[PDB]
Motif scaffolding. Structure first.
Motif, PDB file in Angstrom:
ATOM      1  N   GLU A   1       0.756  -1.287   0.000  1.00 36.37           N
ATOM      2  CA  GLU A   1       0.000   0.000   0.000  1.00 36.37           C
ATOM      3  C   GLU A   1       0.641   1.091   0.000  1.00 36.37           C
ATOM      4  O   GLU A   1       1.531   1.124  -0.564  1.00 36.37           O
ATOM      5  CB  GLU A   1      -0.988  -0.066   1.252  1.00 36.37           C
TER       6      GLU A   1
ATOM      7  N   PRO B   1       0.117   3.798  -1.908  1.00 36.88           N
ATOM      8  CA  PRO B   1       0.213   4.074  -3.325  1.00 36.88           C
ATOM      9  C   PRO B   1      -0.085   5.485  -3.719  1.00 36.88           C
ATOM     10  O   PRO B   1      -0.642   5.678  -4.643  1.00 36.88           O
ATOM     11  CB  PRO B   1      -0.840   3.093  -3.930  1.00 36.88           C
ATOM     12  N   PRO B   2       0.233   6.451  -2.966  1.00 28.94           N
ATOM     13  CA  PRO B   2       0.143   7.882  -3.163  1.00 28.94           C
ATOM     14  C   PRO B   2       1.610   8.319  -3.386  1.00 28.94           C
ATOM     15  O   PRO B   2       2.408   8.338  -2.467  1.00 28.94           O
ATOM     16  CB  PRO B   2      -0.385   8.412  -1.848  1.00 28.94           C
TER      17      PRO B   2
ATOM     18  N   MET C   1       3.181  10.880  -3.796  1.00 18.61           N
ATOM     19  CA  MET C   1       3.754  12.062  -3.128  1.00 18.61           C
ATOM     20  C   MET C   1       3.952  11.960  -1.646  1.00 18.61           C
ATOM     21  O   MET C   1       3.797  12.791  -1.058  1.00 18.61           O
ATOM     22  CB  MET C   1       2.906  13.314  -3.503  1.00 18.61           C
TER      23      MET C   1
ATOM     24  N   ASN D   1       6.583  12.742   3.286  1.00 26.17           N
ATOM     25  CA  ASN D   1       6.420  13.064   4.721  1.00 26.17           C
ATOM     26  C   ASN D   1       5.764  11.894   5.456  1.00 26.17           C
ATOM     27  O   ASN D   1       6.290  11.446   6.351  1.00 26.17           O
ATOM     28  CB  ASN D   1       5.712  14.401   4.905  1.00 26.17           C
TER      29      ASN D   1
END
Lengths: 49, 56
Positions: free
Chosen positions: B36, B38-39, B41, B44
């Protein structure tokens, strides 16, 4: 200098000052500072934002 | 050995079949991304609460 000063007897709605000396009033200067209010740390999820 | 002639020969197939299924299941997951986050960006990335750690 055309909206801020109203002569006696003139409509004062949009003016700042009104009076007998209005015709000879003028801005020495004007200054503005704009502050922006916002929310930061934009969330990201499995969909994105 | 005393093996009957019945159910148990069916049972041997069933055992083999079950084991093959288990192995495939075990190996059948695609070597892939299933963990997972899977963003793309997500440098942080702090989903809970403050004060966290990465190794003991």
């Amino acid at each position: 200098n055309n909206t801020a000063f109203a002569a006696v007897g003139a409509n004062p709605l949009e003016a700042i000052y009104q009076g007998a000396g209005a015709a000879d009033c003028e801005f020495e200067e004007i200054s503005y500072t704009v502050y922006q209010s916002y929310l930061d740390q934009l969330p990201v999820g499995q969909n994105g934002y | 050995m005393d093996k009957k002639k019945l159910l148990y020969w069916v049972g041997g197939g069933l055992v083999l079949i079950l084991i093959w299924l288990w192995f495939r299941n075990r190996p059948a997951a695609q070597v892939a991304s299933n963990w997972e986050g899977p963003p793309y960006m997500t440098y942080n990335q702090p989903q809970a609460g403050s004060v966290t750690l990465p190794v003991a």
